[PDB]
Ligand binder design. Structure first.
Ligand SMILES: [Cu+2]
Length: 228
């Protein structure tokens, strides 16, 4: 499926993101729109909290809110699980453990709906501290560059990822977010299971000066590496 998979991402692909969340019993929705250019490893997305103010800091939702847009170098083309699963797509599930705070559990369907790459997500957040860095909104509106360490999950016919997000705190401390990820294909066709490698992920967060709703403008650059 990797040959057809590759061809689905050769140009600029429209993206739709839909997130329904419940954190410590606070319900919210995020809707995101933009485009991906896998050839350049580039994402541009605009996200709206459609339900009011986001009950958690925007930066905490970045990993949850489409790794099929990663730039896989030619010599790593056999290691691109994400594109090989398209168009039928994959289920992406995470546990995100915030050090000394609560936990997100996420389940996402990533697939083509017509010519649009859609990321449809459910998030449940539990056991957050009422006056922690997250519910207290003490995280800076910024984002560090990270390596996502990918390994094959042969039993699942998919992949696992492990990484720790470093969120800058307003007092100059760092809030760690331990990510446990598994991806499983939705389709029955063959997918590529990779040798161990990483995704070099860089994220720029900005604001739309014209937008009244709680929102996040995102630009992301992602390249696969760690295989010679
Ligand atoms: Cu294939």
């Amino acid at each position: 499926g990797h040959k057809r998979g590759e061809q689905l991402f050769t140009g600029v692909v429209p993206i739709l993101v839909e997130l329904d969340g419940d954190v410590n019993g606070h319900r919210f929705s995020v809707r995101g729109e933009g485009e991906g250019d896998a050839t350049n490893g580039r994402l541009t997305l605009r996200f709206i909290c459609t339900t009011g103010r986001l009950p958690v800091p925007w930066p905490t939702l970045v990993t949850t809110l489409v790794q099929c847009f990663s730039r896989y170098p030619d010599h790593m083309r056999r290691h691109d699980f994400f594109k090989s699963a398209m168009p039928e797509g994959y289920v992406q599930e995470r546990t995100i453990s915030f050090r000394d705070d609560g936990t997100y559990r996420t389940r996402a369907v990533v697939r083509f709906e017509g010519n649009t790459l859609v990321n449809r997500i459910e998030l449940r957040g539990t056991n957050f501290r009422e006056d922690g860095n997250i519910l207290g909104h003490r995280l800076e509106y910024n984002y560090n560059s990270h390596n996502v360490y990918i390994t094959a999950d042969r039993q699942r016919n998919g992949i696992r990822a492990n990484f720790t997000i470093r969120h800058n705190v307003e007092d100059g401390s760092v809030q760690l977010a331990n990510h446990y990820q598994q991806n499983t294909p939705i389709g029955n066709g063959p997918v590529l299971l990779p040798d161990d490698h990483y995704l070099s992920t860089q994220t720029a967060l900005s604001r739309d000066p014209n937008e009244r709703r709680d929102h996040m403008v995102l630009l992301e650059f992602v390249t696969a590496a760690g295989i010679t």
